[PDB]
Amino acid sequence: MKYMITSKGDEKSDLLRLNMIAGFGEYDMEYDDVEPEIVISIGGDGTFLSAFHQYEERLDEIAFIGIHTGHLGFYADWRPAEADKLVKLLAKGEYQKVSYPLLKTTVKYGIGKKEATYLALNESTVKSSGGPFVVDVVINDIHFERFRGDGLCMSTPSGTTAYNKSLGGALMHPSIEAMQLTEMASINNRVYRTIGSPLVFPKHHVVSLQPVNDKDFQISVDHLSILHRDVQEIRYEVSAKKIHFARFRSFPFWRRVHDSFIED
Amino acid sequence: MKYMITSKGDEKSDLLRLNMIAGFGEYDMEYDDVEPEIVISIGGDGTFLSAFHQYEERLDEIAFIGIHTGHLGFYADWRPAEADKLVKLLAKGEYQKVSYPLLKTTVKYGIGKKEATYLALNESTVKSSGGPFVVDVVINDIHFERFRGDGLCMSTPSGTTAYNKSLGGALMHPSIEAMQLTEMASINNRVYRTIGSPLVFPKHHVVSLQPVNDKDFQISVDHLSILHRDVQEIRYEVSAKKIHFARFRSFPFWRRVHDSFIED
Amino acid sequence: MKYMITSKGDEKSDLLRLNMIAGFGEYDMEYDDVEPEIVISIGGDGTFLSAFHQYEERLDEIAFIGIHTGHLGFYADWRPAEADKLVKLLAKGEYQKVSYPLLKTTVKYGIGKKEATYLALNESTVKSSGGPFVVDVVINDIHFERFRGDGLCMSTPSGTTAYNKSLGGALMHPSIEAMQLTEMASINNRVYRTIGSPLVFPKHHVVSLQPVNDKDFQISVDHLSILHRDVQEIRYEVSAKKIHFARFRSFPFWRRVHDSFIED
Amino acid sequence: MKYMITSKGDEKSDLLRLNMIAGFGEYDMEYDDVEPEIVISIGGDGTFLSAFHQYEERLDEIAFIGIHTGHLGFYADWRPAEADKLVKLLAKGEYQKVSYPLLKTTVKYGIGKKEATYLALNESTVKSSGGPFVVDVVINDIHFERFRGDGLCMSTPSGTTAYNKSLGGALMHPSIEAMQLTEMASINNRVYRTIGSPLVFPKHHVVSLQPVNDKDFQISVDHLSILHRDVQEIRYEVSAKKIHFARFRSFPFWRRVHDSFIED
Ligand SMILES: NCC(=O)NC[C@H]1O[C@@H](n2c(C#CCN(CC(=O)O)C[C@H]3O[C@@H](n4cnc5c(N)ncnc54)[C@H](O)[C@@H]3O)nc3c(N)ncnc32)[C@H](O)[C@@H]1O
Ligand SMILES: NCC(=O)NC[C@H]1O[C@@H](n2c(C#CCN(CC(=O)O)C[C@H]3O[C@@H](n4cnc5c(N)ncnc54)[C@H](O)[C@@H]3O)nc3c(N)ncnc32)[C@H](O)[C@@H]1O
Ligand SMILES: NCC(=O)NC[C@H]1O[C@@H](n2c(C#CCN(CC(=O)O)C[C@H]3O[C@@H](n4cnc5c(N)ncnc54)[C@H](O)[C@@H]3O)nc3c(N)ncnc32)[C@H](O)[C@@H]1O
Ligand SMILES: NCC(=O)NC[C@H]1O[C@@H](n2c(C#CCN(CC(=O)O)C[C@H]3O[C@@H](n4cnc5c(N)ncnc54)[C@H](O)[C@@H]3O)nc3c(N)ncnc32)[C@H](O)[C@@H]1O
């Protein structure tokens, strides 16, 4: 139906996009970047994340597809050589959609109410604004720990192969509706203690970070990173919303992991 | 109904057991260690694991309860001081059961067929029988990696706070039906590569370990450790069977984790 | 001889300082904070680091002593209760000095020459100024790796129990004239590789960090953190300079470590 | 002078050995495997370790050289293609020797005195004989920790790229006269605490492991692994003895590390 194509913007990706637009012109496919039904990302995983956040208000009406023009992007399940086969199978349709869970981040501020919510496909992280980073971690209203260190990272399942992995987190198959919290350089001695281990939470569990001294934090959501001031609370939970991928052939997650980290 | 009580066997635990037997005698409670309906473990987590494996053929007909006479056992949710309240609330009943997932281990041998299956509440591990440990890891029939190192550990959710934790694994809430694979001292250089990260698998995923040279392995299931010879394959999957706990009050998993590792 | 006392500035530390000044008044001790010969720090390890950097141009003419008014500071080897014994043994003298190695950091800039050097007692770290952090690591003019991640930390021996420890670094006895490099959340996949392991360098080895794209970095030296622009190179080596401590009794490093992390 | 050549024993290494023997026959070189002065190892690092232990009573009278017939052995600094250049430069001599530190392991037994000492080029490790592994760690007669876990590894500097590396240890340049202790899967909770971090000790420091319950341990020294019974103490210290290598060209340790783990 309606489709759109976002491009990394280098010469290689722009030309692939133009050629795919020409190929779609031979079918009942209409280019519309306002309310598309298929969103094709041509570039890398960064390009795909921007595509996701470009259309995160219409997630349930869109199936995403990624083409990697550089090396294998984790959200890319297509090489540029297969772009014509992509046009054709997409044109005919009859594909099946797969859904990965997402992370909801709520940021509460002081001096009254006011709230901001964000959706993450990889992760959301919290760091301080220059000084020391100290937050109380509250799990389902239960005070769990006082964290002192560089920061905290909350990952989706498909995010576990990204920042989460570099922090020592586990890789979880994206059929598991969960989120995973990992530490960044916690201090542990006689007076300061954190769990250390990554923590994996199911749906409906709420993880709340609460300031202890400084109330300014650098908060990231995927690629976006903003300094938030007068923060009262940061709440993490598995979103009710999901991202849908258009799948045309079997490419299992664990094979995707193998290709990306073991050999290809 | 029918109940039984297993004891660590020290003076403290035997006397608590005898006193609980006397208290149960004042109700319609019948001691039967053949087909009990409630199994009470008095001791530590080792005592509770033995209780579980003592009755693993009647898991769906039994609710387990643990009393820790030493420090807080992770499967113990009762102190000895509360044993009388335990007798009474157990006597009246009306409690609710909670269920944790279990791990199925299948060991296939050569020189014909023959198979052995085991159930694990904490984990199952594989090490070599003296020489180097080398196995191919196959996930859902897909060759994932060739592991060279000291061994591998596959953990249940409630097991993730045990051996899994010491190996760098994530802690997962036991409502998640999953199993987690962690490495023991893998070698990684120009010629040998493993994923490194712990891996978390959902139900219905099968992880198969396959010998490369030596076919003898030391295989553990919770406390039991046996040398298996002429092994053709070791298969891991989340069991369809579950362990049921009798719960009388709220004691959340993450509070249990906090009490055991942060402070109490 | 000449001495001075720096204070954390809370009520507890200021009063201890005034009382020690009064006690020193009963001996041939002269207060001089311009060219002191003994520098006493009253507070925590942060207070001691400021004391060190206050007098880092006269390191070879000064013996440092730390009193911890809070919990045991790692550079503090005296409790407040022993302050009078400190005055007296310091007054009589005859103590012996011990020396720990230091880290030299040289920052070279572009648009001409120009250089800045800094001395570190704990560590020096490098992070990016917002964007991705990518540096080439060059050891004794040999290209070792291209690091992609959050940053790098170079620690002195006595620094290894601080930030270095939280990053997974080894603890090294301060009689070893060395420096230790640890990674902060490196990315490792098919295209990006770092060593992962902490690296320990002897004297006369030079570790050079060289920019790949962005040339702006946040560089810390102990507590001081500055954004450096137009950076051409960051060079690390074990300093020829050393910090001298006044020692009055045996308090071994490994006992100091035990008291700080195991139990006290 | 006198030389000998040990071979991995595969067809490739035996033939290289025979060809080198023929080449040495054209010089004043005499084959003697009783009191050689040059020991050439042809194979892998395992072959080189056997060569070292074959002649560990004449370490100060021997210079070692390694040829790797498989991939780059860490103690191999020669490819098979350069074997003739090796013969010739060795024949002429005038090379310079380099020395790496070694680890001394002393095992004391009960039921009287009796002692066994061993020399290690890579490491010495301690594990239990089946049951739980619990030892008290005593550093220079100071009780440091009670270790509960899978075992402990004490590495030389050149050993730090081997088992030590897989356990999270730091890589240290072999000019540093030190040894490094790393944990194997320590348990850490409310009642059990270890340092966690690897520990690096200078010369003259003594690390003593002392049994708590079971007195039987599996003790390894490089490739050799023996069950020791009635053990009273295991003592580690940097040896006064050193291994000498014959060096013909510059091949820096950090380049050796880069070639072995980053790329080649
Ligand atoms: N200049 C492009 C670049 O090299 N970026 C990151 C690399 O990671 C890969 N990757 C991404 C991605 C992405 C896009 N980037 C950049 C952009 O959006 O511009 C934002 C993400 O950065 C991650 N990240 C940040 N810091 C670190 C760190 N220290 N260590 C590891 N990852 C880190 C966070 O998670 C961000 O979400 N998602 C996944 C995934 N799901 N699975 C597996 N791999 C993934 C990319 O293919 C690429 O190889
Ligand atoms: N002598 C008793 C002893 O100290 N044993 C182990 C300790 O671990 C606790 N623990 C147990 C348990 C248990 C019983 N034991 C002994 C027995 O059965 O005799 C078998 C298990 O050993 C574990 N284990 C083996 N090696 C290591 C290691 N290197 N590091 C960490 N744990 C290790 C494995 O997982 C076995 O299943 N299950 C859990 C859990 N679910 N959550 C949190 N904590 C748990 C116990 O309270 C106790 O503190
Ligand atoms: N508000 C005071 C505070 O809690 N600060 C840090 C804590 O660490 C201890 N500590 C210090 C110190 C110090 C002073 N601070 C503060 C100041 O100067 O204001 C600067 C240093 O911060 C360290 N640091 C930074 N980020 C992290 C992190 N993520 N994880 C661990 N440590 C971190 C760096 O290395 C800095 O040098 N040097 C050592 C040492 N040698 N041995 C053992 N312990 C040490 C202090 O007793 C204190 O418990
Ligand atoms: N079948 C041969 C094999 O693959 N063996 C080990 C591999 O490690 C390399 N290696 C060796 C070596 C060696 C010889 N072997 C075998 C033999 O002697 O037969 C004994 C050593 O095993 C190590 N080892 C044991 N367990 C583990 C483990 N879990 N993880 C990592 N290493 C482990 C210990 O340290 C032993 O000393 N010393 C070093 C070094 N200095 N630097 C860097 N790399 C080194 C070898 O090139 C080889 O690639």
mmCIF file of C-alpha atoms in Angstrom, chain A residues 71-72 150 163 165-167 185-191 259-261, chain C residues 71-72 150 163 165-167 185-191 259-261:
data_model
loop_
_atom_site.group_PDB
_atom_site.id
_atom_site.type_symbol
_atom_site.label_atom_id
_atom_site.label_comp_id
_atom_site.label_asym_id
_atom_site.label_seq_id
_atom_site.Cartn_x
_atom_site.Cartn_y
_atom_site.Cartn_z
ATOM 1 C CA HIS A 71 28.020 -4.197 7.355
ATOM 2 C CA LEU A 72 25.165 -6.236 8.790
ATOM 3 C CA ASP A 150 28.571 6.301 36.248
ATOM 4 C CA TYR A 163 24.921 -0.939 24.854
ATOM 5 C CA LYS A 165 26.061 -6.124 25.864
ATOM 6 C CA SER A 166 29.080 -3.847 26.380
ATOM 7 C CA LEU A 167 28.019 -3.439 30.029
ATOM 8 C CA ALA A 185 30.931 1.342 36.917
ATOM 9 C CA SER A 186 29.280 1.085 40.317
ATOM 10 C CA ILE A 187 31.391 1.703 43.386
ATOM 11 C CA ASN A 188 31.390 -1.143 45.892
ATOM 12 C CA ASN A 189 33.160 -1.024 49.237
ATOM 13 C CA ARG A 190 32.380 -1.246 52.952
ATOM 14 C CA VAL A 191 29.858 1.616 52.824
ATOM 15 C CA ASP A 259 26.462 -13.589 12.268
ATOM 16 C CA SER A 260 27.049 -10.319 14.139
ATOM 17 C CA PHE A 261 29.466 -11.497 16.838
ATOM 18 C CA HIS C 71 34.789 6.258 57.245
ATOM 19 C CA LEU C 72 38.243 4.925 56.436
ATOM 20 C CA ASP C 150 32.556 5.219 26.598
ATOM 21 C CA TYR C 163 37.699 4.058 39.550
ATOM 22 C CA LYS C 165 38.419 -1.217 40.480
ATOM 23 C CA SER C 166 34.851 -0.408 39.392
ATOM 24 C CA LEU C 167 35.939 -0.966 35.770
ATOM 25 C CA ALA C 185 32.031 -0.145 27.844
ATOM 26 C CA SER C 186 33.880 -1.003 24.650
ATOM 27 C CA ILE C 187 31.878 -2.233 21.695
ATOM 28 C CA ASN C 188 32.983 -5.598 20.341
ATOM 29 C CA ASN C 189 31.485 -7.248 17.280
ATOM 30 C CA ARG C 190 32.522 -8.475 13.834
ATOM 31 C CA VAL C 191 33.932 -5.082 12.801
ATOM 32 C CA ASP C 259 39.690 -3.161 55.820
ATOM 33 C CA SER C 260 38.163 -1.143 52.969
ATOM 34 C CA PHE C 261 36.449 -3.920 51.003
#
